[PDB]
Design a protein around this ligand. Sequence first.
Ligand SMILES: Cc1c(Nc2ncc3cc(Cl)c(C4CCN([C@]5(C)COC[C@@H]5O)CC4)cc3n2)cnn1[C@@H]1CC1(F)F
Length: 256
Amino acid sequence: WDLVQTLGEGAYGEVQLAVNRVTEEAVAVKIVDMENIKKEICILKMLNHENVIKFYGHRREGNIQYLFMELASGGSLFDRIEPDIGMPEPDAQRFFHQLMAGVVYLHGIGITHRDIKPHNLLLDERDNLKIADYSLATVFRYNNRERLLNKMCGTLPYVAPELLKRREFHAEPVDVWSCGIVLTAMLAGELPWDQPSDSCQEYSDWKEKKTYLNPWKKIDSAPLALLHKILVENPSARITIPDIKKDRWYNKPLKK
Ligand SMILES: Cc1c(Nc2ncc3cc(Cl)c(C4CCN([C@]5(C)COC[C@@H]5O)CC4)cc3n2)cnn1[C@@H]1CC1(F)F
């Protein structure tokens, strides 16, 4: 293998582009220096879906670990969001459709990603969305028995409010919430708050239904009605993915 270009840096290591000078297989390799990556390497092998990054192999070199993965030539969804504008409504809808397909799959196999944000959603040559980075992905369901979460993790502008206010919380509603923040960012090129806390003014304005303020005023009435169901403070009264799949804007035919 031969390292060519850095594709992003994380908490433990860095992701590189490894093109073998014999097979020419352009793949992405997370080079992890130095228990937690045993669990990461595990979950990665259970992943077989078109909207989920493919885990190829894992060679070991004493301390320098390697993680071969599917390369997304198109880059990431973050690089496709124009600051303060976002992207077109038909483009945002097609990415949300693929985001839900990848999240439904993950949930069906008892896995929560725990850090859904534009930097973890990579686009291939045909612009298909793929969910990458399972360094925070944990098991929330094993043998048809759901386990609650207690560890706080993710990125503050994308985390659900229950994650900072409750000792234990369901995994799926947290993933639904972060998808709503992704859809907000695609339709308006802006994040609505630093974190959903009772100390954050922008979050309090949203709870008080002040949709005349940004970034809500840049979003159409159809997708905004979906965001009103996804960004609900109470995770029990918050829309589920099966009910998201029946929303007017989710099923609204779009082009140009
Ligand atoms: C071809 C390309 C990519 N492709 C790519 N492919 C696979 C990736 C896999 C992972 Cl895990 C990753 C990681 C994904 C997660 N991140 C973070 C930890 C998330 O936020 C902070 C890090 O960026 C690191 C790389 C990246 C991959 N990238 C990316 N850029 N570019 C070039 C610009 C361009 F499009 F021309």
